[PDB]
Design a protein around this nucleic acid. Structure first.
Length: 89
RNA sequence: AAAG
């Protein structure tokens, strides 16, 4: 239910952080810090996430269950080699 | 926002 909506959110954000997307997503990489982290609230603004929910705790909850991304406080990054992706602003 |  809300579990179902969490699964859709999780898979959507897991796409953003997939290698297939990252190879062409220059905006996302320009917003990374040098460690690969992005604000979760920036992801929350992306059209396909905001369509599903504007509930920030639901977005956090969806991502805690992810093996693709890791959360530190308010930021999220790809778990595998995140430092390879950031680009100059 | 050609799934930023």
């Amino acid at each position: 239910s809300q579990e179902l909506l969490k699964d859709y959110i999780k898979r959507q954000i897991e796409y953003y952080f997939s290698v297939d997307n990252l190879e062409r997503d220059f905006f996302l990489r320009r917003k990374m810090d040098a460690d690969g982290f992005l604000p979760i609230t920036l992801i929350a603004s992306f059209h396909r996430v905001q369509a599903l929910t504007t509930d920030i705790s639901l977005i956090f909850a969806a991502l805690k269950d992810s093996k693709v991304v890791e959360i530190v406080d308010e930021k999220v990054r790809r778990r595998e080699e995140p430092e390879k992706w950031p680009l100059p602003p």
